[PDB]
């Protein structure tokens, strides 16, 4: 799809000529805002002392929190 005033929607990144918008890969990478990123950002995975509060989506990175012992 086409960029809007140079920008691609959340959950997308821009192509290598600045002309096209490409969807992030669900569960793999993300893009939170209207952007001119050349790729989506890789999702964070929680480290062992942490629980996943919400999963990575194309528009939102993983949210991790310590288990019963913050923080």
């Amino acid at each position: 799809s086409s960029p809007s005033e140079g920008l691609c929607p959340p959950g997308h990144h821009i192509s290598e000529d600045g002309r096209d918008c490409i969807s992030c890969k669900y569960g793999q990478d993300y893009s939170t805002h209207w952007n001119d990123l050349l790729f989506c950002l890789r999702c964070t995975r929680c480290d062992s002392g942490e629980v996943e509060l919400s999963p990575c989506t194309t528009t939102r990175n993983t949210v991790c929190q310590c288990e019963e012992g913050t923080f």
Partner: antibody
Amino acid sequence: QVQLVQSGAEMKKPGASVKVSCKTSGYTFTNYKINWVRQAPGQGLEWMGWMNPDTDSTGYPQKFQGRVTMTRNTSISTAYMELSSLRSEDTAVYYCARSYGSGSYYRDYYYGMDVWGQGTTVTVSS
Amino acid sequence: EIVLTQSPATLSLSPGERATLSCRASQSVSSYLAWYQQKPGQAPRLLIYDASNRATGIPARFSGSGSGTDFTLTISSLEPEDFAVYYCQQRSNWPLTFGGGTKVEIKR
């Protein structure tokens, strides 16, 4: 012996165009992007855009759309940059430089602009 | 466009002294920042890619660090051949851009 060898210095009149060539050897030409970068006298580096020699896809900063064309001839492993409607301000050394990673490999497999041509001086004047 | 600010523009240091060069991006570029060196009348030369990875052929006294908006090129001890101009470069956002450069010159 990975090398990028550029064409010689050029003089141009305002309004003309210049075509600089960048001949590569020592690797598979089709496997790396070519970038063009210029430097006016006593100034910084300015990126001009890039080309995927494999698919012939290009992209240029908005400031250079219309004026910059990147082409390649795969059979001779050389990339070209053509700059049209030249002005005084286009007087610069022009460099080509390869970089690895395109499309779905660009984010994760990029190792910088690792080998550069020697540069081509272009003087624009009447 | 991402604006890369290299400040100060000139750094005056002695041979055998530590150098710390600053590159600041107008907005986060995560780890997608490269460093180049250029001596007068020579092509630029890659030093560091993706913020902290030293390139082949580059001596261990060069190292990059930082992420987001604040990046540092450190030269642990200046050698005569290290006095040159240094440029940072971001690759995360369209279009790719360079910083305006920092010249490291010899203090005497």
